C-alpha cells in the first residue's frame, strides 16, 4: 500500500477526576474496534455520562469534545459494582460508533460521529505540539487525579467499614476516624496533592483498629 | 547545554496482573523524583513485593528486572486499604533509590541500584524496537489484565456483600450468585478475556437483588 488511513489523534472518554481514558490510540489503522468496562462512581447512581474525546492531553477539558450522551436505568448498587461496557467502533468508512451497554440489563445507548467531526489538520498539529510541550504539567495533573481518586475510594470504603463495625469500634477510634474523614473529604475538593496525601496518611494512622475489625468480619 | 543525561528507558514496578506500572518515563532528565501510592491485593496481606523494572513492554516479565525487595509488617486490613507509597529517586550521580513506605507505621524498605545496572546500549535499542514491534500484542495483554483485575475485584466485593447481606438475600439468589462466583473464580485463572467478561456478565445478571440490598445497607 502507498497509503494508510490512520487516526491522527487518540479517541477516548472522560473518566473519574476529569481525565481522558483512551480507547483507540493515535495512529491506529481503521477499521478498528476496542472496548473497556467502566462502573459508577457513587452509590445508587442511576445514569453515567459518556463524554467522547479526541486528542492527546491528560485533562479531558484540554481535548476536543466530540459529543456526549447518558446511559440511564442503572439499577441501585454500591459504587464500583455495575458494569458499563464502552465500545469504540470505527468502520471502513471512517465513521465512529460509540456505545455504552449496561451488562446487567443489556440496555444500550450510542452516539455516531461522522468521519469529518473533530479537529481539522491545523488543530491536530497544534494538539500534537501542545501535548509534547505540556508533557510534564500533564504528568503532574495525572498524578494528582490518581491521588484524589484513591483518596475518594478510601473516604467511602472507610465510611462503609465504620458502619459495618458499629459497636465493635472503640468510641475513641471512631472520633479520631471521623475527624480525619472530614479533613480528607475537604482536601479532596482542592488540587493540593500533598494535602490529600497528608489527610490520607492521618486516616491510615488512626484506623488501625477499624482495619483489624473489618478484616476479621470477612 | 550540548548534552543532557536522560533515562533511555522507563523505570517502574510490577503491579497486580503482571504488568509494568511506570514511575519514571523514558527520556526524563535527571535528577528526578516521583512517587505513587499502592495497596495490598489480598485481605490480611502482611507484605508486598516491590519488583523494579526497566523497559517499555506492558508485560513485567518482558522488561529487565533491576531487583526486588519486600516491605513487611503491614497490619491486618481488607485488600485495597493499606497505603504503600513507592518513590523512585534518581540523583545527580545517576543512582536509583527505590523506597516503599507503609504510611500507617512509617516502616520503610529500600533498594539502591547503581547507574551502571540494567540494559546496555545494544539491549536498550532492541528493547525500543521490540516495544514498537509488539505495540498491538502489548495492548491486548494490557486489556486482558485490566479485565482480569476488574473480575477479581468484583469476585471479592461480591463475596463480601453476600456475607454482610446474610438472611436478607433470598436463598434462590444466593444459589445463582454462588454458582456464578465459582465460574468467575475459574475463568480468572485463564487468559481468555471473553470468558472472564461472560462470567462477569452472568454475575451482574443474577446479582440485582444483592446489589439493592448492599446499597440499602449503606
Amino acid at each position: 500500500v502507498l497509503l494508510l488511513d490512520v487516526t491522527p489523534l487518540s479517541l477516548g472518554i472522560e473518566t473519574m477526576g476529569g481525565v481522558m481514558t483512551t480507547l483507540i490510540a493515535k495512529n491506529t489503522t481503521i477499521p478498528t474496534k476496542h472496548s473497556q468496562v467502566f462502573s459508577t462512581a457513587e452509590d445508587n447512581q442511576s445514569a453515567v455520562t459518556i463524554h467522547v474525546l479526541q486528542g492527546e492531553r491528560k485533562r479531558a477539558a484540554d481535548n476536543k469534545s466530540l459529543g456526549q450522551f447518558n446511559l440511564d436505568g442503572i439499577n441501585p448498587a454500591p459504587r464500583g459494582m455495575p458494569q458499563i461496557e464502552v465500545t469504540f467502533d470505527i468502520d471502513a468508512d471512517g465513521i465512529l460508533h460509540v456505545s455504552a451497554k449496561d451488562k446487567n440489563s443489556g440496555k444500550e445507548q450510542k452516539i455516531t460521529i461522522k468521519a469529518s467531526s473533530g479537529l481539522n489538520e491545523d488543530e491536530i498539529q497544534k494538539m500534537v505540539r501542545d501535548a509534547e510541550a505540556n508533557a510534564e504539567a500533564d504528568r503532574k495533573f495525572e498524578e494528582l487525579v490518581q491521588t484524589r481518586n484513591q483518596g475518594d475510594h478510601l473516604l467511602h470504603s472507610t465510611r462503609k467499614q465504620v458502619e459495618e463495625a458499629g459497636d465493635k469500634l472503640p468510641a475513641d477510634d471512631k472520633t479520631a476516624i471521623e475527624s480525619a474523614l472530614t479533613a480528607l473529604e475537604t482536601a479532596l475538593k482542592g488540587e493540593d496533592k500533598a494535602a490529600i496525601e497528608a489527610k490520607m496518611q492521618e486516616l491510615a494512622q488512626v484506623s488501625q483498629k477499624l482495619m483489624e475489625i473489618a478484616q476479621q468480619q470477612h | 547545554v550540548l548534552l543532557l543525561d536522560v533515562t533511555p528507558l522507563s523505570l517502574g514496578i510490577e503491579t497486580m496482573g503482571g504488568v509494568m506500572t511506570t514511575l519514571i518515563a523514558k527520556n526524563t532528565t535527571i535528577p528526578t523524583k516521583h512517587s505513587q501510592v499502592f495497596s495490598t491485593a489480598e485481605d490480611n496481606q502482611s507484605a508486598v513485593t516491590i519488583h523494579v523494572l526497566q523497559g517499555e513492554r506492558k508485560r513485567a516479565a518482558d522488561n529487565k528486572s533491576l531487583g526486588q525487595f519486600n516491605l513487611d509488617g503491614i497490619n491486618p486490613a481488607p485488600r485495597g486499604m493499606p497505603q504503600i507509597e513507592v518513590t523512585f529517586d534518581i540523583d545527580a550521580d545517576g543512582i536509583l533509590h527505590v523506597s516503599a513506605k507503609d504510611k500507617n507505621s512509617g516502616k520503610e524498605q529500600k533498594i539502591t541500584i547503581k547507574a551502571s545496572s540494567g540494559l546496555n546500549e545494544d539491549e536498550i535499542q532492541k528493547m525500543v524496537r521490540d516495544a514498537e514491534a509488539n505495540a498491538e500484542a502489548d495492548r491486548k495483554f494490557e486489556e486482558l489484565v485490566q479485565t482480569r483485575n476488574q473480575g477479581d475485584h468484583l469476585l471479592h466485593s461480591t463475596r463480601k456483600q453476600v456475607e454482610e447481606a446474610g438472611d436478607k438475600l433470598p436463598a434462590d439468589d444466593k444459589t445463582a450468585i454462588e454458582s456464578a462466583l465459582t465460574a468467575l473464580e475459574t475463568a480468572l485463572k485463564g487468559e481468555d478475556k471473553a470468558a472472564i467478561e461472560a462470567k462477569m456478565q452472568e454475575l451482574a445478571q443474577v446479582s440485582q437483588k444483592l446489589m439493592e440490598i448492599a446499597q440499602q445497607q449503606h
Binding site: 473519574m16 462502573s39 457513587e42 | 485495597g80
Partner: peptide
C-alpha cells in the same frame, strides 16, 4: 455523572 473503575 462520570464513570469510575470496577472495584
Amino acid at each position: 455523572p462520570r464513570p469510575g473503575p470496577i472495584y
